[PDB]
Amino acid sequence: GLMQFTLPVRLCKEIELFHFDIGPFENMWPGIFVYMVHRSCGTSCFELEKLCRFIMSVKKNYRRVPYHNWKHAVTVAHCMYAILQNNHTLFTDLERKGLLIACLCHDLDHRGFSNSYLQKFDHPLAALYSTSTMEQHHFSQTVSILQLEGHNIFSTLSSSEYEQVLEIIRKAIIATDLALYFGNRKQLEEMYQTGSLNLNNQSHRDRVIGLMMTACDLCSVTKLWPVTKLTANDIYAEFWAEGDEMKKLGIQPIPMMDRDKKDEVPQGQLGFYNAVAIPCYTTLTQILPPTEPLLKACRDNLSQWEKVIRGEE
Ligand SMILES: O=c1[nH]cc(-c2ccncc2)cc1CCc1ccccc1
Ligand SMILES: [Mg+2]
């Protein structure tokens, strides 16, 4: 356990910031992840040999899709890490352990398609799981990987702690279903304004961790503009392939997914920042004030999209 992980100076400093980009070197992503677990949870919360084997099995089960890939998994885990490090005392030993793993695992074996497309195509996963289709799959793949010989990073936990951490991970991954986000934020909003929000209420924690998962999952909108803009290209590469596949089933896709309607991209972003990103990070800052930088960066990027529309770039 005397084996620390250390990053080069620039990464060591930049990694603490909400807008850190993990960079184009795939082979450094596992070290970045281990470094985040060690600083977030202690050097003592996982057997390194088991952690390393788990990370490489998780990596192996992300597919080579334009956006919902291994890079996304680590980007989302880094954002969660920035949140946990800026709210040290608000989270239990187990929550910290569970949530970084939840984030690395949250999109396992994603095929590049929405729950909507699964249902319309009539994929087997849509009969097996009627709602949060991909998200029940991702949690399923997580549990499968935990049961591979030498992969149970949670072996040291008491039997009850083990059930607590797998329940934190399960609610965490399900919460990445953006259809569940809207109600979840409205309830948190109401509960914080009426003053009822109580973090000793497990069901209240659940909702808050759900909102953090949405915040970490959407964190491309909180980066520096060139990262945000270039991540949007990869996001649209999947959306447009899905629209192509909708058209192949005889269905007109929503314009966001229709590569004929690229013209409408800037206005689509406006919609999304106003309907989703800004409310998400607004509510998140109200409940966890040290996450304000996510809201500020999101606001700057909305402003950058406004400039794109006004032909100023
Ligand atoms: O970072 C993201 N991750 C996921 C989403 C998303 C959109 C719709 N449904 C589910 C998740 C959008 C963004 C960024 C904003 C964005 C970029 C590109 C296209 C449209 C919106
Ligand atoms: Mg997902």
Ligand SMILES: [Zn+2]
């Ligand atoms: Zn995701």
